[PDB]
Ligand binder design. Structure first.
Ligand SMILES: N[C@@H](CCC(=O)N[C@@H](CS)C(=O)NCC(=O)O)C(=O)O
Ligand SMILES: N[C@@H](CCC(=O)N[C@@H](CS)C(=O)NCC(=O)O)C(=O)O
Lengths: 215, 215
C-alpha cells in the first residue's frame, strides 16, 4: 500500500525511511538507479525526476519535506510535530532555514585550500545559528525525543561526517559547536536512527566520488 | 494584538496582508524602512533581518510561507488549505516549487538582449509547468476560491507585470499561457486582492529602480 522510490545513500530518502519507521508504516523500498530512472519514477515525479517519492494508494508525493508533512498528517499517532501553532511555526521555520542553507555545504565538494577553509567556516556559522537559536539546551530539536526538525537535520550527522572526511576539512567539532556535536551523537544513538543509516564506509566512498566529479 | 512589520511594495508582505484580511484579523501595519531597520525588526528576525514579520501576543513569526501556515492554524475558520492530506501535500508541493523557482525571475533584473530573451523563455517554462500541472482547468489554485497556493503565486500578477514593463520583455501572455493569464486576471479581480495591492505606477517605479541598481 506504501512504496518508497529511494536509494541506499540519499539523506533525503533516509528522512522518509525514519518517518515511516517512527509511524510503524509498512512499505516497499524500491531502489532507483539514478543513471537509469524507472518508468514509474518519471511518471510519479515529472517536475524534478528525483528521489524520494512516496506512493500511497497509487498516488505519488515527491520532495522529502512535503512527504514528511504528509506522513505526519496521514498517520497522526506518535506525533512528529508539536500541537501548538507557534511551536509548529518555529519547527517549520528551522526546517526551512536548513533547506535554504543546505546549498552552502556544496562548496565543500568543489573548493580547495584557502577557499575550502572559508566554505567550512561559513558552514560552521550556519550550524552555530541552528545550535544557539534552534536547538538551545534541549536534547533534541523535538525536545526529549526526535521530531521532524531532528529528521530534517539528520544529514548533518553521518552524511556531513563523510563530507568532512572526503574534503579534508572539519566543520562539526565538539570544541566549536558543543551542543550541536552532542546532539549529533545523541541522534545517531537513537535506536531507530542507528538501525537505519547507510554503512559509513560505503557512504564515505560515495562522498569521495561526488567530490572527485565536482572537482 | 497582531502587528505586521512590512512594506508597501514587498510581494512577500502582501501575502500576509491577504491572509490576515481573509481571516478578518485586526492588525497594525508597521512599515519598515529597509535602509534603517527598526530595533524591533532586528530583535524579532535576527536570522534574516527581513520583512514580513508577524508579531502575535508579542511573539514573532518570520518568513511569509511560515507566517501563512501559522495564520491558517491559528485562525482555522474560512480555511485557506484543504482538509485531505494528499490535497494538502499537493498545495505544499506547488508552494515549494514557486519558492525554488522565484530565483529564476531575478535574471529579468540583470540580463539584456539575447540573454534576457533566454531568461524570459525559462520563466515561461516555469509558469507553464505551474499552469499545466498545478492550476489545470480550475478557476483558482484553491478551486472555486483563493487559497494559500493562489496567495503564494500572487507575485506573478502585478509584481511580475511591473518587472515585464521595467525589463521590456513579455512573460505571462494570453497566447502562450492561456489558463495562467486568465487566472492572473481573475486573481486581481477578487475584491480582497483588488482592494489590497500596491499602486501600479509606484510598483513600476520601484521595479525600474531595482533593475537600474542590479544592471
Ligand atoms: N529537494 C529534494 C532533493 C532530493 C534529491 O536531491 N534527490 C537526489 C538524490 S540525493 C536525486 O534524486 N537526484 C537525481 C539525479 O541525480 O539524477 C528532496 O528533499 O526530496
Ligand atoms: N523569504 C522571505 C523573503 C522576504 C524578503 O525578501 N524581504 C525583503 C523585502 S521584499 C527584505 O526584507 N529585504 C531586506 C533588505 O532589503 O535589507 C519571505 O518569504 O518572507
Amino acid at each position: 500500500d506504501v512504496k518508497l522510490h529511494g536509494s541506499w545513500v540519499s539523506p533525503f530518502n533516509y528522512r522518509v525511511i525514519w518517518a515511516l519507521k517512527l509511524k510503524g508504516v509498512e512499505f516497499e523500498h524500491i531502489v532507483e538507479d539514478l543513471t537509469n530512472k524507472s518508468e514509474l519514477l518519471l511518471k510519479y515525479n515529472p517536475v524534478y525526476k528525483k528521489i524520494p517519492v512516496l506512493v500511497h494508494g497509487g498516488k505519488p508525493i515527491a520532495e522529502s519535506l512535503v512527504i514528511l508533512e504528509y506522513i505526519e498528517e496521514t498517520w497522526p499517532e506518535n506525533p512528529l510535530l508539536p500541537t501548538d501553532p507557534y511551536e509548529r511555526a518555529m519547527a517549520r521555520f528551522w526546517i526551512q532555514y536548513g533547506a535554504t542553507k543546505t546549498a552552502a555545504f556544496g562548496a565543500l565538494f568543489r573548493a580547495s585550500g584557502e577557499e575550502l577553509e572559508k566554505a567550512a567556516k561559513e558552514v560552521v556559522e550556519v550550524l552555530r545559528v541552528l545550535e544557539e537559536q534552534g536547538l538551545g539546551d534541549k536534547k533534541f530539536f523535538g525536545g526529549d525525543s526526535i521530531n521532524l526538525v531532528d529528521i530534517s537535520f539528520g544529514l548533518f550527522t553521518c552524511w556531513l561526517e563523510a563530507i568532512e572526511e572526503a574534503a579534508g576539512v572539519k566543520v562539526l567539532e565538539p570544541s566549536t559547536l558543543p551542543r550541536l556535536h552532542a546532539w549529533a551523537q545523541n541522534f545517531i544513538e537513537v535506536p531507530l536512527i542507528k538501525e537505519n543509516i547507510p554503512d559509513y564506509d560505503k557512504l564515505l566512498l560515495h562522498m569521495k566520488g561526488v567530490r572527485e566529479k565536482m572537482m
